Amino acid sequence: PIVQQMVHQAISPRTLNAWVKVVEEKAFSPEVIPMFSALSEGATPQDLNTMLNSVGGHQAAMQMLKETINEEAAEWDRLHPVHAGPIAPGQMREPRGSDIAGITSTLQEQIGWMTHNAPIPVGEIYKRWIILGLNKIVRMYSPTSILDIRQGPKEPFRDYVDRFYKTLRAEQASQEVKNWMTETLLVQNANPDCKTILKALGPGATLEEMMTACQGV
Amino acid sequence: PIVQQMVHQAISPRTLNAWVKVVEEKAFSPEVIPMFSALSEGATPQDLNTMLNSVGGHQAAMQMLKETINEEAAEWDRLHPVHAGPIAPGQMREPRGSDIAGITSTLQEQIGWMTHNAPIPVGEIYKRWIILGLNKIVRMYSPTSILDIRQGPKEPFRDYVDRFYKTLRAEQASQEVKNWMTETLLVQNANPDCKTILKALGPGATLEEMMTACQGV
Amino acid sequence: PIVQQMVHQAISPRTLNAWVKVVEEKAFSPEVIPMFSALSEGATPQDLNTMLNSVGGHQAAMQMLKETINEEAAEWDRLHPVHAGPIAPGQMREPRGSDIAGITSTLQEQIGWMTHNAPIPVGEIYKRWIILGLNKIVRMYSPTSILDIRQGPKEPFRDYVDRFYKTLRAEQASQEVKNWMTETLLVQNANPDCKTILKALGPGATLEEMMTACQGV
Amino acid sequence: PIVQQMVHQAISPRTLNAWVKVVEEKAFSPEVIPMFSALSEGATPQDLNTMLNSVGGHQAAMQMLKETINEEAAEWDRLHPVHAGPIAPGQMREPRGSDIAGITSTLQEQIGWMTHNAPIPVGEIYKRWIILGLNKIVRMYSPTSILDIRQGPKEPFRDYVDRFYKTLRAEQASQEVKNWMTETLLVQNANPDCKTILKALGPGATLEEMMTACQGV
Amino acid sequence: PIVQQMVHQAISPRTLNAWVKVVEEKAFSPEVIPMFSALSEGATPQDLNTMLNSVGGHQAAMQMLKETINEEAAEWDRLHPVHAGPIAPGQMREPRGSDIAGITSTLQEQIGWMTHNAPIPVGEIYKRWIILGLNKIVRMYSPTSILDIRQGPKEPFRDYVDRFYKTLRAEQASQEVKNWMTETLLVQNANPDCKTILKALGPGATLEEMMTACQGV
Amino acid sequence: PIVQQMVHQAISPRTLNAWVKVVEEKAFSPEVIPMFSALSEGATPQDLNTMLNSVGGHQAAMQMLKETINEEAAEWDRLHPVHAGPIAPGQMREPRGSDIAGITSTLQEQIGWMTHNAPIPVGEIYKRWIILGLNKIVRMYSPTSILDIRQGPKEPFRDYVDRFYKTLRAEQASQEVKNWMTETLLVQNANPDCKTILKALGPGATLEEMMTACQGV
Ligand SMILES: [Cl-]
Ligand SMILES: [Cl-]
Ligand SMILES: [Cl-]
Ligand SMILES: [Cl-]
Ligand SMILES: [Cl-]
Ligand SMILES: [Cl-]
Ligand SMILES: [Cl-]
Ligand SMILES: [Cl-]
Ligand SMILES: [Cl-]
Ligand SMILES: [Cl-]
Ligand SMILES: [Cl-]
Ligand SMILES: [Cl-]
Ligand SMILES: [Cl-]
Ligand SMILES: [Cl-]
Ligand SMILES: [Cl-]
Ligand SMILES: [Cl-]
Ligand SMILES: [Cl-]
Ligand SMILES: [Cl-]
Ligand SMILES: [Cl-]
Ligand SMILES: [Cl-]
Ligand SMILES: [Cl-]
Ligand SMILES: [Cl-]
Ligand SMILES: [Cl-]
Ligand SMILES: [Cl-]
Ligand SMILES: [Cl-]
Ligand SMILES: [Cl-]
Ligand SMILES: [Cl-]
Ligand SMILES: [Cl-]
Ligand SMILES: [Cl-]
Ligand SMILES: [Cl-]
Ligand SMILES: [Cl-]
Ligand SMILES: [Cl-]
Ligand SMILES: [Cl-]
Ligand SMILES: [Cl-]
Ligand SMILES: [Cl-]
Ligand SMILES: [Cl-]
Secondary structure, eight states: OEEOOOEEOOOOHHHHHHHHHHHHHHTTOTTHHHHHHHHTTTOOHHHHHHHHHTOOSOHHHHHHHHHHHHHHHHHHHHHSOOOOSOOOTTOOOOOOHHHHTTSSOOHHHHHHHHHSSSOOOHHHHHHHHHHHHHHHHHHHTOOOOGGGOOOOTTOOHHHHHHHHHHHHHHOOOOHHHHHHHHHHHHHHTSOHHHHHHHHTTOTTOOHHHHHHHHSOO | OEEOOOEEOOOOHHHHHHHHHHHHHHTTOTTHHHHHHHHTTTOOHHHHHHHHHTOOSOHHHHHHHHHHHHHHHHHHHHHSOOOOSOOOTTOOOOOOHHHHTTSSOOHHHHHHHHHSSSOOOHHHHHHHHHHHHHHHHHHHTOOOOGGGOOOOTTOOHHHHHHHHHHHHHHOOOOHHHHHHHHHHHHHHTSOHHHHHHHHTTOTTOOHHHHHHHHSOO | OEEOOOEEOOOOHHHHHHHHHHHHHHTTOTTHHHHHHHHTTTOOHHHHHHHHHTOOSOHHHHHHHHHHHHHHHHHHHHHSOOOOSOOOTTOOOOOOHHHHTTSSOOHHHHHHHHHSSSOOOHHHHHHHHHHHHHHHHHHHTOOOOGGGOOOOTTOOHHHHHHHHHHHHHHOOOOHHHHHHHHHHHHHHTSOHHHHHHHHTTOTTOOHHHHHHHHSOO | OEEOOOEEOOOOHHHHHHHHHHHHHHTTOTTHHHHHHHHTTTOOHHHHHHHHHTOOSOHHHHHHHHHHHHHHHHHHHHHSOOOOSOOOTTOOOOOOHHHHTTSSOOHHHHHHHHHSSSOOOHHHHHHHHHHHHHHHHHHHTOOOOGGGOOOOTTOOHHHHHHHHHHHHHHOOOOHHHHHHHHHHHHHHTSOHHHHHHHHTTOTTOOHHHHHHHHSOO | OEEOOOEEOOOOHHHHHHHHHHHHHHTTOTTHHHHHHHHTTTOOHHHHHHHHHTOOSOHHHHHHHHHHHHHHHHHHHHHSOOOOSOOOTTOOOOOOHHHHTTSSOOHHHHHHHHHSSSOOOHHHHHHHHHHHHHHHHHHHTOOOOGGGOOOOTTOOHHHHHHHHHHHHHHOOOOHHHHHHHHHHHHHHTSOHHHHHHHHTTOTTOOHHHHHHHHSOO | OEEOOOEEOOOOHHHHHHHHHHHHHHTTOTTHHHHHHHHTTTOOHHHHHHHHHTOOSOHHHHHHHHHHHHHHHHHHHHHSOOOOSOOOTTOOOOOOHHHHTTSSOOHHHHHHHHHSSSOOOHHHHHHHHHHHHHHHHHHHTOOOOGGGOOOOTTOOHHHHHHHHHHHHHHOOOOHHHHHHHHHHHHHHTSOHHHHHHHHTTOTTOOHHHHHHHHSOO
16 A cells, blocks of 8 residues: 555555455445455555455456446546657656556556656545445345335334345445435334334434334334 | 654554454443544544444444434534635635535545644544444443342342443433432442441442442342 | 654554453453553553443442542642643643543643643553552452461462462552561461471571472472 | 665565465465465565465475476576676676576675666566466366356356356466457356346346346346 | 664563463473563563563462562662762662662663663663573472483383473573583483493484484384 | 664564464474574574574474584684684674574674674574574474385375475485486386376476376376
């Protein structure tokens, strides 16, 4: 990574090992995406490729990630056309999509783009593309849909809310659609007892009020 | 985090892993709140969101935390109205509530608000809101009330005090109300033997005197 | 903590985790007090409160510690009366007892008192009070008294000395009283064989001479 | 290693231990090669030889690695003929192939070549040769060929893709040949149900479309 | 500790934990003394007392260590008489024996004696006394004497040499006496087969020659 | 150790613990020698003696190591005769053999010889002697000879090569003799099937060609 006088560091064994263990244990659970970002703070494309390629197994998801990264690289290419000509002594060459992904750019070039003034944060751009692919994978590997989360007859409300917001965290929808799902399905798909209790509260009750209301049930 | 010449560091694997393990092991026990603060010392909103989002499961509590943070952000908004206009070259833009929570503010902007003179410690404000939500969760997940802690007939006084001050630590009440609870319930709800022994001591005996008095019982 | 150009650091996960594990494993054994001090070297009151509050369970002892700290704070208050008036631009405000314990003083104020010339080491004062309370707890949780340590008929002398100086380490008495206890009880409460062997040595034999004399027995 | 003011560090116990454990656990799986590179970032030839020689067992593969490194060293020799003569006071001696591999060059000489201006990155050259040998080993120890990966009658498509791209990751072929293998064999060697489903999609469907199409099957 | 611009550091959790585990696992085996020294490199008397007092159990040995340290302190006192008078502004006070052992000297005073020019390395003096006591303990807790190590009839020579030099490492004797013990007892107390084989070699054979000679036996 | 502005550090707990565990687990396997060197990079004689003396058990091998180091010290003595006279203010005293081994030289003197211009790297000289003794031990504790490694009738070629180059790694012979052993015994001592297959390849086939040729067998 690069940390602040900015200097370049090699990726630590604790970081890489921690990421490998995260993929081994949690597979592709939503919390993997924050952890990944946390473990890639200030990373060069070389460090990002290091983290991705250090994963054994799950090669279907890693190939999908490759294809997503390729799409984003092509979009960057058509959106940023490269200008032909010799680079000046005090200038950097324009990065291609494959240069953002650390495929066709050396570590020195990445340090150059990231640190030198008028910069291009290639590491955070690549990280953005990676996170897009990771969210697509998280969608694909979520078994349940939010529309099928229903409270059991004897299920405590709290556990049902845990399931609901886990599945909702796995759903691929904008925050307004998520807001609608909380607005409708949560109270809609509760068992009749808690459903009546919550319906009596009014359409503007917080989750704390709702959980306190049905905690005895 | 940011540590003192102030410099910005990435969050360490030991810190994040330690927090994840703390939530996995202790669930939402009161001691989680100090640990959290200890693990968030000098953190930017990005690090705080990193710690919160790295938690799998307990998504009901995490959603409640989101709603609490939203309330505090709205209060900050109405209390700090944003002034329209272009920001000067040597000035920072006024942070909104969503900027305090790291939702709508970049890492660079957070470094700017935290370090630059005439500062706004957005990390400690966000941390304050988070701790409010965490205390609400700790209340909700405490099964017992302080009014029901009663010493058993053969229960040693020391264990009863452990239960009493654990449950009391989970109670949501001001320090004066807590002082009243220690003043009344502790001696009130002991078994008749220790109750008589303590009643003989006088209304101004320390906990050490009380525990030494009933340690034989 | 603060370490030497003096700079302020956040408390490390290894330190806090190590302390939590120390309390979990050793409960309130005497060696906990050195370890604590070792883990609090150069700590601010915020770090000390962090270590104390990160302890789950043992809430009777933690409450006793709170009461001891309150007593010491009151003594500091009556011994150091606060002078009313506005603080000068280049001066610190006088710390109250609650400011020493990190209850009513910010981290910035603690850094100020500890680092600025003509200093007040509030961290080491608070640490002193904490250690007083910890010694009181160690007394209360010691089951045996030094007067009851007696060598068994077939017990090797070495194990009896281990028990004797463990219990003695738990005793609350000045070093002169401890010197008297070593002078009298150790030889007094040995089994008749080793008791005769030691009595033949003279009143001025070292522990090495005494243990070598009875190692065959 | 050497990290950026560039300074020379000794190899850390976490790095060497991590590499030894990687070879012990994963044998010669493809992900070993990225990890190795990650653990050798900025390494001198002494550190590379340290990592290679610290491996017990697998001595057939380590000998093959030695022979590959010898071939690359001979090629460097014939491609870079050494010029006879005394080295100037402010100049470095021309490195031989055995000097790149850390066999006949001191640590001081390696620091000299790597740091001094007009440099020769001997560590990354040696690392390149090592990675060539490692890829040859990875080929030799891959049991299956890509031409034999066939979906089972009841095998979910996702697992079949995992096998396919694992074996493909082990294959020694250019990226164009790999592109042809994905273009032909993946759809070719699926079971008739998924084979028909995929054939209906068209010759230009992404892996995400293909996996979503057959996830019910 | 203090490490080189010399600066004072707090003792690390890895060091203290490592020492505690060393005493827990190895009790008082000879290798404990090097480890201790390694873990106390550049330590102040506060760090040394920290390591010693962090040991639970073995309180007989720790008390013996206290008595040894007291003897050495008294010898330092009579050998270095303190001169009465006020200390100059740029001078240190003369350290007493109790000041060397960190009993009656603050951390600041220890830093002063150790760092300031014309220094007194109180940490290494205290460490020397501690190591004297530790060697006395190692003698006391060694069960066997070197005079009783005898090779079994079917015991391989190598194991007998392991026992011999372990027990010899535990013996309290000068290096000339140890040289005599190797010169006499090793060949003297071997079984008749190896005894004849070694006697044929001559009085000037190395341990390698001796072990190679009897490795078939 | 000493690391580059050169500064002296204390040996880390991870390094010493790692070495102790290496000896405990691998005994005296060849890979111990690289690891040792890796863990002693930039070490003073005090650190080397620290690593050697921290080893419990294996005291026959450690005594042999002592005797080897003594031989090398005597050779250094006769090869470097000490010149009598007083040392100048800006000069170092000539190191004896016992000074190289950290027996009769303080840490300060070792820092002096290693850092001061016109230096004598006493740490790397001592390390060289130690490695000589370690190689002698590795020879003595290798049970098999290279002349007895023979492929089984049903043994895969790859495992036989593993045994062959392990035993060969344990052999004490120059690289030309090793080259002859690979040239003759490897093909000589294979089973008749693989022996014929390899004999058909020609006297100039690489190990990769040989292993690929017999991998079906
Ligand atoms: Cl995995
Ligand atoms: Cl998954
Ligand atoms: Cl790869
Ligand atoms: Cl651009
Ligand atoms: Cl951009
Ligand atoms: Cl519930
Ligand atoms: Cl969890
Ligand atoms: Cl909970
Ligand atoms: Cl998230
Ligand atoms: Cl503001
Ligand atoms: Cl504010
Ligand atoms: Cl009790
Ligand atoms: Cl606990
Ligand atoms: Cl206890
Ligand atoms: Cl608290
Ligand atoms: Cl004051
Ligand atoms: Cl004071
Ligand atoms: Cl005994
Ligand atoms: Cl291995
Ligand atoms: Cl393999
Ligand atoms: Cl080697
Ligand atoms: Cl060149
Ligand atoms: Cl090149
Ligand atoms: Cl599937
Ligand atoms: Cl112990
Ligand atoms: Cl022992
Ligand atoms: Cl103590
Ligand atoms: Cl003196
Ligand atoms: Cl001295
Ligand atoms: Cl033998
Ligand atoms: Cl061992
Ligand atoms: Cl061995
Ligand atoms: Cl030793
Ligand atoms: Cl010399
Ligand atoms: Cl030399
Ligand atoms: Cl084979």
